[PDB]
Design a protein around this ligand. Structure first.
Ligand SMILES: NC(=O)c1ccc[n+]([C@@H]2O[C@H](COP(=O)([O-])OP(=O)(O)OC[C@H]3O[C@@H](n4cnc5c(N)ncnc54)[C@H](O)[C@@H]3O)[C@@H](O)[C@H]2O)c1
Ligand SMILES: NC(=O)c1ccc[n+]([C@@H]2O[C@H](COP(=O)([O-])OP(=O)(O)OC[C@H]3O[C@@H](n4cnc5c(N)ncnc54)[C@H](O)[C@@H]3O)[C@@H](O)[C@H]2O)c1
Ligand SMILES: CCCCCCCCOCCOCCOCCOCCOCCO
Ligand SMILES: CCCCCCCCOCCOCCOCCOCCOCCO
Ligand SMILES: [Zn+2]
Lengths: 708, 238
């Protein structure tokens, strides 16, 4: 054949037409690693040298077209000095450009997924034919970067600025249908005709029926937009993307700035603008922290496979108690293809449960996000009841009854005599010990905790709690069920506050110490929000409810007296005793009518302000963050969670930890372990919550890190 | 349009049109004359007095209705044995009219068909703007699938819609009787079996009657309440 490599082959077909096929031998997918790029160079040069070639069809031999390279190489590449990185990209882009400059018609036959570099290869061709089942997109922004192989150059010149921005700033996958509407692709056909469609199209280009040169031209020149229309397009894009991505996410806005700077340039100059911005982003702390999240996910996925080796699929589930959590769990379960029994003690309880499940389902249909027929499937999946008559074949039962040890131990013991003896039982409790609850059972090996967060349909995290008696099967099954419900499960050994709450309170402690020190709480969360937190401490406390936080504190104080027990009344006590229960109550740190600042709180908090200590925004962040990060380290050291990835993702999913900061442990890594320990000691006066651990001090000196 | 929709046997609709057409260029008084003439004509037709006779029949039925209601116990909670064609149809109807109902069956597959159909109908109406998505929710939540008698404790009336087999029906009927209040009414939807025969398998036949629906349950207007030799007036009235 014209060219035969280990990733690419160029085989001659009829009428001088040639087919360049991607099929990375030995691997499950095609991707632009070093090997493939090098072979593309050779394949292009081979075609460029074969004067008998009349056209080229670019296809794939895998189920996907071409996806991104291994995250591993991204990490390496981004460590190189700007000059090298840019030079390496200049070289890669040269390959694609040379393929684009072939004095022969070219067509990309998209059979499956074509993401990032994969799509960029397609954009380099004259035409693109896509299977109706395939998807394409540029997910670069997910990693804190943006298209690096001409994506920001070709996409805008092919489908227009507005659409290119939408694809690049969102990194969403696009279905065949949509890709055709914006003209990212030229034709959409069934999988069986992809080959014939590509062959038919190429011939029409060769015969001159289709002017492939004219179709290529647009990506070799400036955008068609006016200076005026350009200003309107770019400025609104920046404005819209800004208030949606946030100030802490450079990638989205840089991509727009890059397309704006290249607006009046042809290919080569526009590539330069792209390369420079790319290099800049690849070195941002946001990027490698985002990439780190990706690495964490990969780790979680490997543990997922291990769990699945023994995890028993949950065909029939059941939840005890309707209402807030119960109904929420029922909705989720049914919404994800798993029939579930909603058990309660009175019709009124089932009313609330069914009522809410309805509002959500109706809400989605009332916004074209859901089919009336689908809403039917979900509702039929939820089966209300007040007896255990149908529990006979339930595989997993989730207990979501009142927060009362007595009550839970009674109910749990009761249901156990109504399910198979191999059925898994789980409690949704947030402040009670799973190992304690398990003692009321005769089969504790099948009991675990399945902790969801309010609102169940919104919160991504689910803490699967392993009690001392909890079997690997019980844990594995609960894990897989959570994943099936569309959640992100993380196993945590039983302990007060588990992983999430246990880490949040030391965080709230610091917030308590700040307020007691006369620091304005409005300034505080404005700083923490700028830091990246969705909601500030004060506001978060309100949303969660002061009463809830009051109770939580007590539980943690009992759980870890050596560091979470405070011998002075805080702002929580002052607000609770003053009946300022939070958002639900209408009043907490703020007043809600929605969120307003009302001076009437000053009086309530006055008795709490001990000293009038002056502080900088940087101190505020440390008073808050040091306790949170150290408590996470303690959880890792105590073995509450097995790996750093699990702990960090636990906070990313359950606490809304700033993504561009990677997690609590990764934050310490960013600052530098030694530096972090030093920093912590500087606030040693604040208490035990700020005291590094021996293991930490040790790795601080051995040059060790949590992810490094 | 009216012709091909009312049929040749219904003069009224077309006559009204003919009257308006004849009076088209007339003022009030002359138009009234045209109306009066056509009215007199229709009032004497056979179709008219037969239609008016249906009205008289309805009146009679409504008077008997009031008598039944003097003792009839409202059905707050109902149950239907067997999903599928009739069973599912009955569930749908009951739930569609403000009466919670348990859909009992013997296997998951049976409940599937029942719920599937109840859905197609509800979805069909919403897909035609004849029904609110919120309403469809109320109906579905009204139907409660099950495979046990654990919730039959407070059922006021149970409709048996199982296979057409005397032996099977007598077994099921006798079984459910031990899972409902002793004042609960039991009914069979059977079309070819004797209600008085089926009642002999029961220990409380006074509460057993027939509640015969027609396929498709949601379409057919008629329901034959069958009184067995032991059927009490209360069981029938309810
Ligand atoms: N903030 C939250 O909403 C939140 C977050 C996470 C976890 N949780 C956990 O969820 C549980 C409470 O859930 P909730 O907030 O929805 O309470 P809820 O009061 O809103 O609902 C309780 C429901 O359970 C029913 N019930 C009571 N006793 C029962 C029994 N013996 N058998 C069956 N049903 C019974 C009640 O009638 C009621 O419908 C607690 O364990 C709590 O720790 C709550
Ligand atoms: N031709 C018709 O459609 C029609 C018209 C009028 C009256 N009927 C009457 O309806 C009844 C049959 O209903 P169908 O047409 O839906 O037949 P069908 O076979 O479609 O439905 C029978 C359903 O009952 C379930 N079942 C069987 N034994 C059961 C038990 N012990 N407990 C609970 N469920 C049980 C089966 O699994 C099945 O889902 C008969 O009495 C028949 O005379 C039928
Ligand atoms: C070129 C543009 C890239 C776009 C950015 C999106 C990121 C896509 O990169 C994915 C690379 O993932 C790297 C993971 O490789 C490790 C292999 O995992 C081993 C498990 O094997 C299971 C195979 O199914
Ligand atoms: C004391 C009660 C505890 C309440 C805790 C809840 C408060 C947290 O609210 C923040 C909302 O959480 C948002 C979750 O963020 C989703 C994570 O994004 C997924 C991206 O992951 C990247 C995978 O590659
Ligand atoms: Zn108190």
């Amino acid at each position: 054949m014209i060219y035969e490599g280990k990733a690419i082959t160029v085989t001659a077909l009829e009428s001088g037409i040639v087919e360049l096929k991607f099929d990375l031998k030995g691997e499950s997918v095609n991707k632009f690693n070093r090997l493939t790029l090098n072979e593309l160079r050779q394949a292009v040069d081979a075609i460029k040298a074969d004067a008998s070639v009349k056209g080229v069809i670019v296809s794939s031999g895998k189920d996907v077209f071409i996806v991104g390279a291994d995250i591993t190489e991204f990490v390496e590449n981004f460590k190189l000095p700007d000059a090298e990185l840019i030079a390496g990209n200049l070289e890669a882009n040269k390959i694609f450009s040379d393929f684009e400059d072939l004095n022969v018609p070219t067509v990309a036959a998209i059979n499956g997924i074509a993401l990032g570099g994969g799509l960029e290869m397609c954009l380099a061709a004259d035409f693109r034919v896509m299977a109706d089942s395939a998807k394409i997109g540029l997910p670069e922004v997910k990693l804190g970067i943006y298209p690096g192989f001409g994506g920001t150059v070709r996409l805008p010149r092919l489908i227009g600025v507005d659409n290119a921005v939408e694809w690049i700033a969102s990194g969403k996958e696009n279905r065949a249908e949509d890709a055709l509407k914006v003209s990212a692709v030229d034709a959409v056909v069934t999988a069986d005709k992809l080959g014939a469609a590509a062959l038919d199209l190429i011939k029409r280009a060769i015969s001159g029926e289709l002017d492939y040169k004219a179709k290529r031209q647009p990506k070799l020149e400036k955008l068609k937009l006016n200076a005026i229309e350009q200003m309107m397009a770019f400025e609104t894009a920046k404005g819209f993307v800004a208030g949606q991505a946030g100030p802490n996410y450079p990638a989205p806005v840089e991509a727009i700035k890059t397309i704006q700077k290249a607006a009046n340039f042809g290919r080569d100059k526009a590539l330069e603008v792209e390369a420079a911005g790319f290099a800049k982003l690849a070195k941002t702390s946001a990027s490698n922290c985002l990439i780190g999240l990706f690495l964490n996910d990969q780790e979680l996925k490997k543990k997922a496979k291990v769990y699945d080796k023994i995890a028993k699929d949950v065909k029939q589930a059941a939840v005890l108690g309707a209402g807030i959590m119960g109904g929420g769990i029922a909705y989720q379960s049914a919404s994800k293809g798993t029939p579930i029994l909603m058990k309660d003690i009175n019709e009124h309880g089932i009313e609330q449960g069914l009522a809410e499940a309805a509002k959500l389902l109706v809400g989605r249909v009332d916004k074209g996000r859901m089919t009336p027929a689908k809403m039917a499937e979900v509702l039929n999946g939820i089966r209300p009841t007040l007896s255990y008559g149908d529990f006979g074949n339930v595989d997993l039962v989730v207990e979501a009854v009142v927060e009362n040890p007595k009550v839970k131990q009674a109910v749990l013991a009761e249901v156990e005599n109504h399910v198979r003896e191999d059925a898994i039982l789980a409690s949704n409790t947030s402040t009670i010990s799973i190992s304690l609850l398990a003692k009321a059972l005769k089969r504790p090996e099948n009991f675990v905790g399945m902790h969801f967060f309010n609102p169940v349909h919104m919160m991504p995290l689910v803490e699967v709690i392993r009690g001392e008696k909890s079997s690997d099967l019980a844990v594995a099954t609960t894990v897989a069920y959570a994943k099936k419900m569309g959640k992100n499960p993380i196993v945590v050994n039983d302990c007060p506050g588990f992983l999430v709450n246990r880490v949040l309170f030391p965080y709230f402690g610091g917030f308590a110490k700040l307020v007691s020190a006369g620091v304005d709480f409005v300034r505080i969360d404005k700083v923490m929000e700028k830091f990246g937190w969705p909601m500030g401490p004060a506001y978060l406390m309100d949303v969660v409810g002061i009463d809830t936080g009051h109770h939580g504190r007590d539980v943690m104080a009992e759980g870890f007296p050596d560091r979470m027990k405070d011998d002075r009344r805080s702002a929580i006590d002052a607000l609770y005793e003053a009946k300022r229960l939070g958002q639900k109550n209408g009043k907490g740190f703020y007043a809600y009518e929605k969120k307003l600042v009302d001076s009437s709180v000053l009086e309530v908090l006055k008795p709490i302000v001990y000293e009038q200590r002056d502080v900088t925004d940087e101190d505020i962040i440390n008073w808050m963050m040091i306790p949170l990060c150290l408590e996470t380290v303690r959880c890792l050291e105590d073995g509450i969670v097995e790996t750093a990835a699990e702990a960090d993702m636990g906070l990313v999913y359950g606490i809304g930890f700033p993504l561009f900061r990677g997690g609590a442990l990764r934050y310490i890594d960013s600052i530098g372990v030694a530096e972090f320990v030093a920093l912590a000691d500087q606030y040693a006066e604040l208490g035990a919550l700020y005291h590094p651990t021996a293991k930490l001090r040790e790795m601080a000196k051995n040059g060790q890190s949590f992810f490094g």
